[PDB]
Design a protein around this ligand. Sequence first.
Ligand SMILES: *C(=O)[C@@H](O)[C@H](N)CCCCCCC
Ligand SMILES: *C(=O)[C@@H](O)[C@H](N)CCCCCCC
Ligand SMILES: [Cl-]
Ligand SMILES: [Cl-]
Ligand SMILES: [Zn+2]
Ligand SMILES: [Zn+2]
Ligand SMILES: [Zn+2]
Ligand SMILES: [Zn+2]
Lengths: 4, 4, 485, 485, 162
Amino acid sequence: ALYY
Amino acid sequence: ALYY
Amino acid sequence: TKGLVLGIYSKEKEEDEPQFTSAGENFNKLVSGKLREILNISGPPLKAGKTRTFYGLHEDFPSVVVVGLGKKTAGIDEQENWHEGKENIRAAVAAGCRQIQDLEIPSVEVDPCGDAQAAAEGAVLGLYEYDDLKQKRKVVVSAKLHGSEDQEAWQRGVLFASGQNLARRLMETPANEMTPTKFAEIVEENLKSASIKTDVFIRPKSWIEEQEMGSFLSVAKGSEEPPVFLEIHYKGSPNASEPPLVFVGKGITFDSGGISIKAAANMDLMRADMGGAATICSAIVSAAKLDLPINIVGLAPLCENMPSGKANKPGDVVRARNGKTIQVDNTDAEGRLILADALCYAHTFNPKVIINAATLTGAMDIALGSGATGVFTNSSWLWNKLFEASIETGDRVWRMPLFEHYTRQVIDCQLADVNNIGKYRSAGACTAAAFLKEFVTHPKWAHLDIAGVMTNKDEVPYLRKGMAGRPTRTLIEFLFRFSQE
Amino acid sequence: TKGLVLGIYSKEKEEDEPQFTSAGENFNKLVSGKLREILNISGPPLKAGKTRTFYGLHEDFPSVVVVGLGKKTAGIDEQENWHEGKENIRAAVAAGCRQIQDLEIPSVEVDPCGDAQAAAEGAVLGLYEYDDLKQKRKVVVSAKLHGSEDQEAWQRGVLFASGQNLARRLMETPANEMTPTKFAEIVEENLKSASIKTDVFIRPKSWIEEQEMGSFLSVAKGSEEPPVFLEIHYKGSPNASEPPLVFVGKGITFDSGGISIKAAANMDLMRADMGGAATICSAIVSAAKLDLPINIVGLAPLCENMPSGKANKPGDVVRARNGKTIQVDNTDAEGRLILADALCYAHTFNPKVIINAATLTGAMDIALGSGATGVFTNSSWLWNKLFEASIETGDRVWRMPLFEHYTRQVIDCQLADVNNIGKYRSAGACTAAAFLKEFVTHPKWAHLDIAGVMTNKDEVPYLRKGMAGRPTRTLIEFLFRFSQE
Amino acid sequence: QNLARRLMETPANEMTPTKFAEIVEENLKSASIKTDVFIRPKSWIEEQEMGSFLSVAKGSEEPPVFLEIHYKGSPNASEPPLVFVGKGITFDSGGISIKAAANMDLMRADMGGAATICSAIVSAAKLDLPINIVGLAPLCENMPSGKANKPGDVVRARNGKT
Ligand SMILES: *C(=O)[C@@H](O)[C@H](N)CCCCCCC
Ligand SMILES: *C(=O)[C@@H](O)[C@H](N)CCCCCCC
Ligand SMILES: [Cl-]
Ligand SMILES: [Cl-]
Ligand SMILES: [Zn+2]
Ligand SMILES: [Zn+2]
Ligand SMILES: [Zn+2]
Ligand SMILES: [Zn+2]
């Protein structure tokens, strides 16, 4: 998952 | 400080 | 004429109905059972933090808000690292007080809910709004204890909450009002109102220069706003020579990033980049209000970080007070620059502990958000004292690592002794902490990166949206326990 | 004909000169003092991890590399949470072995340096490179203990390092070779070589469908590569009915992000998005090699995450095995989708503990980088066991919070029971952990987010650049201690 | 309006072109017997030379449909109808010109045009309005794949324009  |  | 907030617990399996607090049951008696009767008619039971409003029950209390307190016996929750009962009380009382305020009622009495300090915290934190600059405001609500039995604990909650609200005020105020000079003057007046055992020095640029604080000066110079170095003394120990505890706070009154300029989006929140100074200064004011029998020094370098024809330029090399050179590769990593010089100065006091706080890194917000303040410390004793204090206050802390692994990434530096941004994007809060550690020789130092707890949306139920002033109460609780030992 | 690696300590204040290990001093005796004499001539003393090479000292060892071991008595460093002596030995021995390899020498004997396990780990980890696909390779080096006294500890180090190197191989291999099927076949052959007390089921898509693993299936379907659910049993307990420990690993064999597609830059590293499966499977293989008297089950959902005309679409709602619905707002938060179903399945074993590992979030890398694996657990007993194991292995862990604060941000969901990405950017590793917790009822569960420890550049001195296979040895050490209790 | 909200909010893996057409069909038919519904398949879309619509649908493995609904409310069967047309993209990823991740889930509502016009026709039928109405909704997904529209491609619309 990336942030964001 | 930011990343990056 | 006043409003009244009363608590009710969740029903236990062995009870026939949910139980009021003592104050709720007494009020129900006073109104010949009408409170219980109307609560029954109103439908489903009140769960933790929920509220319901009943009108016309008593001539003196036209509006009575019952608030759900959750499980009566809720204590320390080992899965949340806090006292759950106290958190339930703060949330429920805040919710009840907001409902009274929405009804435009200027006076409220509050059930102590078996813990008057937590109740007072919920009311006073819960009602707070920074609205000095708005024509349209909510009614000002005066909250007072219901009853006369729990007064010291009630006032202790008021004092703790007011310390945090001071920090919230200082953080929320726009930066064109809350300049380094204004911040120093407001902390001065608050500390002096708290105790006469206090000295305040609003140290000017000339003193900063005399103190060879080249790293701090390099940040301040981009802006036309004068820097100050705020130094506050609270002389609470019976022995004047007792070494002080020293607190240090980053006081960047506005952070544009400087030449390494920030993006526009939500940059206004950077008015709260003096939150480190706000929380440590506020905690010291509250310690003085509490008469704690300890010597405390507060240190806050205050300036703006702005781009201009005289600002820090990436690659510049500056000399810290301790003589170490710093390569300023990113001008938006300015908090560690100003802290280098303040931390150095901190050692001159022969302190027992050095605790600094700073809204230091975006990486801290990515790491833990607003769940807890990140604590980096070379002392597990000190970690455990802050952690234990946090359980009581509910304003949680979470330990983060000081390892040479991160140090190696900041002392790897093309031009100078230490680089002010890591070699990599990874672990930004940890390499920022490692940079600070290069300016610390003291064996009981803690760095609190509060960037993630700078604001509240809805996460902490008893703080309205805006600057949070966290973790002021955890600092106060720490000082209080330290003074008793 | 062989190379030789010997240790020397840093000089203590009371010593006249730095001391060799036993093996160094004996070799010096054998060469009539020529080792000490040439080391003296060569100049400055050898500090921790540094090396120096001497030629022609003995007909059997034309190249002798002396390596600095640091302080002889270095033990547990409470500021680094590891055994420093063991870390010094691993680094120095790795450095010595690399120097022998650069001289193209195919055989090396290694000083046990007072801890043969740590020495073996330094040599075996230190020499490892994944070069199967390259025409030009370094000489293959066979490292063996110097002497015959410390053999069990030496072989234990070889076994621990080989377990980690297996994980490194599995992680580094390109994803067009390391497909779900290939990964399952390689773990199968390794586990079966380790012990006959083993069952392996490479469960196909039809079985995944029968098991109603809708969340896992939704990830796999974008790609034409068949998914498998790898289930491995190691039956080490003397009682066949003894409840197993269950490990679960995210096995995304390549993560493009899917329809929520990743940027191009360094996307190749996403071949290691099966690192969770690699480390837990490798630890189980090593546990079997160690004969540990415990029952262990390993579970690894394996698939690719690819964009296509059948892939997960943002907003889609999928049903996990436990019947909870998940709103897939971001298709690149796919690890928590596949883990939901594997974690559910994990409960069917009546496990004693459930430990999962996953290269889960970019936020974890921003939080702690490669300094330590982030551990989220509902059991402080389990945290402390993993932490204690990590001190010995040097492959550090660091606890991260499981709080309802983060849960609230994932169960706040427009369409479904839980949302697969938080409402905010903050605390991404914590909200990912909270999502996993919605699929766990077990009272001793730990989630290890290993995204930050997926690769090494130079941070761990005894791992060459590339996939790190961390924290395999900490898992092995945990299992070993658990089996002794 | 709530029917349209349901149709828009439902996740796109449930609200496929086929499912949308079936739900509008059942609602329209419950509203009035004076109704015809044709859930026109890919073969009909091809026969109708709808090359521009087909070029969008082809990137996805989800079958396209062309929904055609008639409400025959006029007392004169030959009275010319009012015609409503709604965009029914059941999920818009952007295709090869792919969208950014942020809030892309809202693109499940890219069939809102079809939802609102179809729902209005259902309500008109429920109201017994004395008018002839035709509703037309091309429905498909917009997805990237090895068969999707490529930037620069030229397609031929039903009217022969490129
Ligand atoms: C979320 O995007 C996950 O699915 C990814 N596997 C996380 C990868 C983070 C890598 C950071 C270290 C290079
Ligand atoms: C680095 O840029 C620091 O100088 C900034 N003050 C950090 C601000 C991080 C804010 C994150 C929470 C909104
Ligand atoms: Cl900084
Ligand atoms: Cl994820
Ligand atoms: Zn900044
Ligand atoms: Zn700042
Ligand atoms: Zn992903
Ligand atoms: Zn992934």
